[PDB]
Amino acid sequence: EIKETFEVDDLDEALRLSAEKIIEEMKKWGVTEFDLKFYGKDDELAKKAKEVIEEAAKKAGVKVKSEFLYDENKDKITLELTGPNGVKVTSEISKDGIKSTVERPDRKVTLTFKL
């Protein structure tokens, strides 16, 4: 069980670094495609999170199947990425930054992106 913490200047940098590291860990575990579920408001932040992940997956040659379940009452974004053979990523996005929990059988990585 490993915790990693990073410092970014802004939420935009948090989104970019987190998407890169998330795709990294999935690429490590032999993932070529994954299902993405998004929970949050239908706004500009939602669009940014989509493009950052899609651009990051595209550069890595990974296919994504995205479902957005919009709920305006949610003040924060939850992302659930499911991959084959038990690969699961949960990313929480708020004004304070991003916390991503990357789960593999016998491997739990928690990534925090502060400021």
Resolution of this entry, Å: 2.1
Whole-angstrom distance, CA of residue 26 vs CA of residue 46: 22
The helix/strand/coil state of 53 is helix
Q: Among 86, 72, 7, which residue's Cα sits nearest to residue 40? A: 72
Whole-angstrom distance, CA of residue 94 vs CA of residue 84: 28
Q: Among 8, 93, 83, which residue's Cα sits nearest to residue 46? A: 93
Q: Could you give the strand order of the β-sheet that contains 2-7, starting from the edge strand earlier in sequence?
A: 2-7, 107-114, 97-104, 88-94, 77-82, 33-40, 63-70
Q: How many residues does the chain have?
A: 115
Report angle CA 100, 35, 95 to the nearest 5 degrees.
Answer: 35
97 CB-contact burial (10 Å; exposed 0-12 / middle 13-18 / buried 19+): buried
Backbone angles phi, psi at 70, to 5 degrees: -75, 140
Beta-ladder partners of 10: none
**CATH numbers and ranges of domains, the chain:** 2-114 (3.30.1330)
